[PDB]
Amino acid sequence: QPTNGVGYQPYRVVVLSFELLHAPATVCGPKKSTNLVKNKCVNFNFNGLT
């Protein structure tokens, strides 16, 4: 009821559960790829693996 104090008011809840297994990705952040430079040393990130 709308007469209730906040401890007795309804709350909606969403729980995002994540896994990055010893297996590939299927969900990613908005971040954008760049060119694969082979045969030089690079700072790198593959599927979030920095």
Partner: peptide, 24 residues
Amino acid sequence: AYTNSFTRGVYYPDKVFRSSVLHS
């Protein structure tokens, strides 16, 4: 009736490459 499995039914435990190594 039954049969002995011997050393059958093993599989790759994870999608990880490993070589020239023993892994537990």
